Each structure stands twice: as C-alpha cells, then as structure tokens.
Structure 1
Amino acid sequence: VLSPADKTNVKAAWGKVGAHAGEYGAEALERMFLSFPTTKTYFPHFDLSHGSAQVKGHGKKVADALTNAVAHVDDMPNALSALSDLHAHKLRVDPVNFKLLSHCLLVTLAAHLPAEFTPAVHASLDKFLASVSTVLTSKYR
C-alpha cells in the first residue's frame, strides 16, 4: 500500500523522467533480457538484439503504461484493467518476472538520474512498481 508521501515522490520522480521514460523503458527490458535470460520466452518472435528497434518501441509502450499508472495512482485497478487482462488472463505471466522488470527499471533510473534517485524516491518507486505488478498479475474482473 502506497502512502501520500509515496505518491508524491512517484509523480515528482517520473516527472523528471519526462520524455525519457520511453528510452528508460527500452533499456530496462534490454537489461532484463540480458541479466535474466529466461524472461525472453515471453518474447519468442521478437527481435531482442542489442538495440533492436522492436525493443525500443515496446519499451516505449511499457513506458507510457507507467506514465498512465502514475496519473491514476489512486484507482490503478480500474486504469490498468486492460493490461491486467493481457499479462494475467492471456499471457499468464509468472509474478517473479515483474520483480525482475521492476528491478531493471530501478537500475536504469538510478543510472540516469543519480541525484533524484534518493533513498526515499527509491523506496517509493519500489512500492509503486510492486503495486503495479500486483494489478497486472491479478484476475479481478
């Protein structure tokens, strides 16, 4: 469960990310596929090569999804129901993979925004992603 203070660090944090979220989303995936090879079995027909155009564009999608998640950090089940349908109803994605992705987005963010990735922002971003992971990995309609 996120605290008000958590919701404030999240919005502010993703704020600096700005038009760089898209890119931060592709790097995260790239890092996730490299360090955690087994995650690629969810993307068989993809082109997961260092710098693939497919990885960057998809990263952009996950990127906008989070942006949307943040604006609706108060009613995310309703806002993320479509993606819930995907990863939970159709893909049946094991929850362990989300921790791997969330981690890789933290690593990516920490790498780009050193000064903003304070311990407080770190905690909050972690709780946020963990909550996003729970909605996407749940079946609640």
Structure 2
Amino acid sequence: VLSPADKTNVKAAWGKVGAHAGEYGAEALERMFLSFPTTKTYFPHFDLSHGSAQVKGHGKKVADALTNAVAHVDDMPNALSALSDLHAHKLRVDPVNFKLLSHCLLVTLAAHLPAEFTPAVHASLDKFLASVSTVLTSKYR
C-alpha cells in the first residue's frame, strides 16, 4: 500500500512534470481516445478531434485531480471522495476504463521524461495510478 520508496518516487516524477501537468493530461486523454475508441462512449458531447479545446480543458482537470492525490497521498479516499461519487456513482464508469487511462498516462510520462522513467519509478507510478483508480471505482466496489 504505497511504500515509502513509492511515495518518494511519485512525488519526484510528478515534480519534474511541473507546470506541464495540464499539457500531459491532454495528451494522455488523446492517446486513450485514439487507441481505445470504446472509451469515446463517455464523451458523446465532446469534440474529440486533435486540437479540441474540450479535450485540453479536460486534461487540465485530470492533471489537477492527480496533483491533488499526490499532494494528499496518505489520504486519497478523503481527497478524492467527490470524484469517486461522480465516477463510480453518477457516471457509472466501467472499471476497465481506468486501466486504459492509467496506461496512456504512463506512456505519456515515458514520452516526456527519459531520465526519470526508470524501472522503479514506473513500478511506483503504476501502483499510484492503480490506487487512484481503486478510490474512483469504490462506490460499487
């Protein structure tokens, strides 16, 4: 349940992302809609095209939610209580979809941080995204 080493790696890899967090969330979301067209089902109201300002705005949202969990890592359930409600309870987001997003987030970090994406930080960041996802699916979980 996120070891001290994991928490340290995650703070630090997040660190490097810095002000690019929002940019990265947009890229991640775009990677998912293209590779996993089944997720597109949940955003009929969006224009999913490439420079879509809907997708950019949402990437920022996703990046801020994550920075919120990193900043509150020992207390994610409480930090992300509202988002859960939304995801698990009002949008009924298939759990499968969190895996796909978490994968595309990792591919995006790997694509931006060649120095920081070691085997260990990758293991850590995988454990963090999976935690995050366990919190957001927990209304029927």
- TM score, norm. by length of structure 2: 0.97
User: Residue deviations 1:19-58, cap 9 Å, x none?
Assistant: 0010110000000000000000010110100110110110
Native 8 Å contact 2:88 2:140 kept in 1: no
DSSP 3-state at the match of 1:74: helix
Moved over 2 A (4+): none
Shift of 1:139: 1.4
Q: What is the match of residue 87 of structure 1?
A: 87
Shift of 1:140: 7.9
DSSP 3-state at the match of 2:138: coil
- CA distance, structure 2, for counterparts of residue 6 and residue 40 of structure 1: 32
Unaligned runs of 5+ in 1: none
Shift of 1:7: 0.4
- CA distance, structure 1, for counterparts of residue 98 and residue 51 of structure 2: 22
- CA distance, structure 1, for counterparts of residue 140 and residue 75 of structure 2: 14
RMSD (Å), alpha carbons: 1.2
Shift of 1:6: 0.3
DSSP 3-state at the match of 1:115: coil
User: Residue deviations 1:117-140, cap 9 Å, x none?
Assistant: 111110000000000000001118
Shift of 1:68: 0.5
DSSP 3-state at the match of 1:76: helix
Q: What is the match of residue 74 of structure 2?
A: 74
Which stretch of the first structure deviates more once superposed, 131-140 or 80-89?
A: 131-140
Shift of 1:94: 1.0
- CA distance, structure 1, for counterparts of residue 95 and residue 67 of structure 2: 21
Q: What is the match of residue 100 of structure 2?
A: 100
- CA distance, structure 2, for counterparts of residue 81 and residue 140 of structure 1: 13
- CA distance, structure 1, for counterparts of residue 40 and residue 86 of structure 2: 17
Q: Identity across aligned pairs (percent)?
A: 100
* Residue 23 in structure 1 maps to residue 23 in structure 2: yes
